[PDB]
Write a protein that binds this DNA or RNA. Structure first.
Lengths: 60, 60, 61, 60, 60, 61
RNA sequence: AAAAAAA
RNA sequence: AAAAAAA
């Protein structure tokens, strides 16, 4: 698996990320955690993002 | 699984939530219940939202 | 589980007017006639088979 | 258990149908055959339609 | 299955095809090959198209 | 994936500039760094993770 | 087929 | 959240 090491590196190093959704919308924050189906993305608030809705995850 | 505790905390504490859909539409209400495939969001009425149609779930 | 089946079953077994919003934002209206694992039969003037994968939300209208 | 008898009746009786795609596009033909993932839609020329791209099937 | 014999006939007989995508874009070419998840479409180049992105496959 | 793996392998091994069209019409460009069952790592000025479910087509640029 | 409408 | 842009 490539997801877990990629996402964990971002979380452990607390790098600012952009999550681009499939609808073109760009979410920004830090990766708090993730499982098989979701990523929790945090700024001032934690939100649950469904991977099915994500196109890409990119360091900001 | 991160999904069940995230949703259950929202449900159990009656948090006002925003559910953003993959078509960019924002729904608002409280998480009434959920299962493997759907979330029941209650404002004036209970509406069943398929998780496949959801991009994000956020406290409002 | 399970919430989906009892929610649809009550709408069906009570013949309640519903709106089914599709993921593209089109709103379909009528009554839940029937459903299975993958589809919902929506009865109006003509009865139609709606794929669940295309549905965002089901609500009483 | 509901999808297959529905599609089988349209096929057997050669019912003119509309297949609305998830992008709103409306295809018209009669259902030639179908399997788990696709439907063959017949008009002048026959075309294979992926179910994942279909929203609804309705007699025309 | 009717999908494999449908695609196989197109490939074997080198029939010019239109592949309509879920975003409404129309691709044209010959079916070079396919597997469970993708189709290789040949026009001026060979391109790998994910089936999940495809609405319809039609002889042109 | 007897077609998918050799196609991506050749682009990665040969460091071929690629274009990835997403299902929403947006085109990404870069080189394929690696890929697995669900994602492609695409590298340009940075490495980004692209979900395959969001991809329509991969082609050499 | 808008390197991407914090919706 | 155009009962639906044969694309």
């Amino acid at each position: 698996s490539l997801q877990d090491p990629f996402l964990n590196a971002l979380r452990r190093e607390r790098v600012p990320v952009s999550i681009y959704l499939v609808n073109g919308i760009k979410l920004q924050g830090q990766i708090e955690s993730f499982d098989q189906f979701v990523i929790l993305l945090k700024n001032t608030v934690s939100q649950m993002v469904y991977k099915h809705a994500i196109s890409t995850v990119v360091p900001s």
